[PDB]
Amino acid sequence: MQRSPLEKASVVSKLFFSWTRPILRKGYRQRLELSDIYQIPSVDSADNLSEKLEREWDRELASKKNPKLINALRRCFFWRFMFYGIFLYLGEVTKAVQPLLLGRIIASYDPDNKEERSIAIYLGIGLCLLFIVRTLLLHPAIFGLHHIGMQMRIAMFSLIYKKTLKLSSRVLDKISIGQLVSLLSNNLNKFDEGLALAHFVWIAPLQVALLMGLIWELLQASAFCGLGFLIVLALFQAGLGRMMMKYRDQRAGKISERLVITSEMIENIQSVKAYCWEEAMEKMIENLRQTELKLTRKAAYVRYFNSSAFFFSGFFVVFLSVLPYALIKGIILRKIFTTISFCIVLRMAVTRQFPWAVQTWYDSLGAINKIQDFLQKQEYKTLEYNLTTTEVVMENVTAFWEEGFGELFGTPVLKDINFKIERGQLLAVAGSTGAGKTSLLMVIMGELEPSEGKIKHSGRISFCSQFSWIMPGTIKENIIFGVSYDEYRYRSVIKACQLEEDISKFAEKDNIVLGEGGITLSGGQRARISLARAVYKDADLYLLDSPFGYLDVLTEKEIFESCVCKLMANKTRILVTSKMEHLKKADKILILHEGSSYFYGTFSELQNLQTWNTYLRYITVHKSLIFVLIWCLVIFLAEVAASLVVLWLLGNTPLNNSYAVIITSTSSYYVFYIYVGVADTLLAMGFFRGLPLVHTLITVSKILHHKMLHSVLQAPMSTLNTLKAGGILNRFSKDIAILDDLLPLTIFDFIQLLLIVIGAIAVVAVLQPYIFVATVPVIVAFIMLRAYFLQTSQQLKQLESEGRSPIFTHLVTSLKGLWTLRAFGRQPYFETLFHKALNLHTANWFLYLSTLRWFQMRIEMIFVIFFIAVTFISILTTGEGEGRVGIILTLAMNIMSTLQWAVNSSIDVDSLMRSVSRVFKFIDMPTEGDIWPSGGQMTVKDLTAKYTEGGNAILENISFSISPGQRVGLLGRTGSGKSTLLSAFLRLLNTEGEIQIDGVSWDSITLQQWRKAFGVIPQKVFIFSGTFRKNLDPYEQWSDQEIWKVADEVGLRSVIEQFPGKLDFVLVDGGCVLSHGHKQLMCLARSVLSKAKILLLDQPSAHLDPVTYQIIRRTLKQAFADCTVILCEHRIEAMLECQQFLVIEENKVRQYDSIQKLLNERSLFRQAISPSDRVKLFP
Ligand SMILES: Nc1ncnc2c1ncn2[C@@H]1O[C@H](COP(=O)(O)OP(=O)(O)OP(=O)(O)O)[C@@H](O)[C@H]1O
Ligand SMILES: Nc1ncnc2c1ncn2[C@@H]1O[C@H](COP(=O)(O)OP(=O)(O)OP(=O)(O)O)[C@@H](O)[C@H]1O
Ligand SMILES: C[C@@H](COc1ccccc1)C(=O)n1nc(N)c2ccc(F)cc21
């Protein structure tokens, strides 16, 4: 990584941006490769800014009574803000006095002998130097302002992340991903680019005053009437501005809901596609989009009228400012022209520079105060005592989940529990489902505040949750988890959890690539990775929270009698089990039941007791756009014809008449100038030509989003597995926020500027031909630069924009699995691992900005050089009478200013349309594309499954047959592909082989009609945000009587009744309110509703107790009376019912008709069954 030459650069390079040149030199010819990007300047490393801002912030917190963040931000950046403000003030004043020189230079052309014929050269010199000072003084201030904005935003983001770790657990459920992702996404670009207009809040007044003086020297007593009209205009403008903000704070409440639905949708699309939930999800998403569109539509209309104020107030202001004086005394055309040339600047400085400045100030303060509110949130205070007697004590505790019951003190989820544990002794807390075992572990963690009672243990702790969590990276890094690696300890850990065979099964031996959460791995490997992590880290206390669920039985006995009982035989271990073998081995027992310590003691006591293609694809996608554009062009043609006839009539005029004092020496070259000064009004857009354009643009954005989603969802899984979660969150947030908010106005402004320039040039060329030849050497000079620039930026924006994802995809995981992350106490590690991604995105965005500002330098210097040459050639070549050529040049380069503005707008439009390019990238994704299920008799021949195209053999040469209504139980040691075969039944992943189902095959039936025959309860439960009734059946086919009768079969009464909204309670954060077993029962009910003839059960009993499990087998007898069942269990007890057994081994299936021959065939499997079940199998 080469160090940025910004640190090593001369002052001329910094004031001219000559050091950016190597990037464009490398980029214009060949595509950018990923070493050319410079390392960030040492100033804007996240650490320095974060430390500076946090020190100022916490000192300000300590000092003041009501701390405010904005005071610390001021104390940090105000000086380098004002040092730039003075330069911007000078560089905008230098636009007030330019028309002063310009008017007299224009006055010289007139043959009658004015004194100006001597001062013409001095005026030209002053004008030349004035332009060069403007160029050297304006842009560097803009770049520095953008740089300060960037630094501020970086420090704020790092502070946000530093807060989102110490955030108290009781608040997490309230705040979902939507708030945070919106608060970063909306800020990212707007708050950075918006610190160039922060000054124009106090620049606009002064400038206006300075203008209202000079115009007053021209116009004695009508400039005040013009100013009154302008003040009315500014009040109307601020009124529209206030109206618009009320139409955003009602959208920002639902953007988060749509974002969270989309994230939950795409993270586990596995179950979504398995269930054939395609249309209901689209209906819900578009239902949200409808309201969001109404709000965006109204906001867009309001924003449109705001924009037109410049373009359609120009004639009105001048008319009402020069009617009275002309009426009373008359006007020489010099007065009218200089009034126009001042009125342009006045219009600009009090129509699009004041209101946008106050807008950006309102919005920046709103975001800052929202962040300040965020930082005022309850902090989880830790009392982990390093001093202890190596003895863990817990006494008389009770806990409350929601804070209201906490303060008001519904039963608590615990009460009056107590235990005491030595060092070297193990507890085994076992509870029937819903008792609160995980809640007890959380209370031991202190993450739940005990409403009353006493806790004490060592400060050295480790954790292994019920639900696994896998941060993206290598298995080696994921297991070590930010510790100095060791050969011997790591090898011992891998020897205990017996990961050796599975780790040898992968292509890369030890370290592979795991995505967010790691769908790439199975369930057993994931749980055992988590357990290995909990074993590796060294501490005085261990909280293993039921890691023995997602495994077979032989692996269970091996791991439990080599790792828990043998490897770590001296260090305290809390164990959550549901097998009598553990309790027999257990040293003390605490059996919970419904939040009550139902039994405590010892097992002996227990026995005793009992790119231009996108430019077209965007437009042609909807016909309304083409119609609007065509009709607008026709209207413009009519308008330019009207202007043509007006100038034709006034050209052939045959001239007491003091209405307009006009003379032949002045007329022929002042009428054209004065018309071109008012071109932007006669060619403006009214409320009859503009509104359809904005409406159609918003409609097109909606259609684009809908198509993008419908193409993402039905995409094949092999493609989907490659892309991350950030690569969808980033898109669905930013690349639709842009297509809804910024584009439908920026493209409109571009259309307007292009249209105005074209019309003015056309009409003036028609009346004066040579001006065309006078302009062309500049326009062809313009595009030549633009086409050279775009190649750099056209390739760089992507290289930066995708760089956003390493932020979001790192924020989600840390937030998703915050609990273990804070459990081990590894905050600094993730702090640095986030700062790295932030510095990456900076190394992209900063250099992109430093290239755009350079192109502004170059474009305005092209204009200035042309302008200096024009003024020199023209004034010098003025003759004793009727100087002609100078008029021809100066009119052209009066047009050139607006044309340059149009070029800048065009660059901005392209930089935004990158977003539409990226969305069309997603839309081009491949497509996986009497009662039929009579008996369900199934036949599979020569099946094999592949995850990646041509990948390794996960299965090979499978074939079997299932008679109708004969449940076959499938089993096999973990990591052998049981879920693989279940998934490959649905041909989700790419397949090979042929299946006959009661006289039909795969080919003879369509895909969607094929998946209708099955019903699935996947290994990964799936609960989005919504109500119970909507969650259980989004299609809404069945009455609440149906739901209520099923909800007693599945034994869900005691879960619905305790919750306030029976079938109408809202669910948040993926059902985090519910437990695990309740989620399992919920999904099983969701499969009972969809009565399918052939059904696949993928581990219906994951962590359930021996008691509640009865319901499972219960709903297997009366409920599924005859339906064919593909049941994939691990607990051997659930295999007593099935008639055939399919054992999966060595990537092949072997079927047997019984159990005895199976078990004698594998001797090592025999000694693993518990005696209570071994007697059941062998009578
Ligand atoms: N995050 C939560 N928010 C609200 N209530 C909760 C939450 N977690 C648990 N509960 C309540 O606590 C009870 C069980 O707590 P907990 O989740 O610890 O049981 P569990 O051991 O996970 O259940 P299982 O044995 O099925 O795993 C449930 O009745 C549930 O209503
Ligand atoms: N999403 C995935 N991407 C790549 N490979 C996968 C993926 N899922 C599974 N595999 C491969 O399939 C094998 C295990 O398949 P599968 O997940 O069906 O086992 P399993 O029976 O589900 O395990 P368990 O007993 O934990 O349920 C592993 O070797 C793994 O490499
Ligand atoms: C599109 C117009 C609508 O008005 C008319 C349309 C046709 C004819 C007459 C009037 C507009 O929006 N205008 N016209 C202004 N003179 C103006 C000033 C400030 C502002 F915010 C908007 C403004």
Ligand SMILES: [Mg+2]
């Ligand atoms: Mg649990």
Ligand SMILES: [Mg+2]
């Ligand atoms: Mg499984």
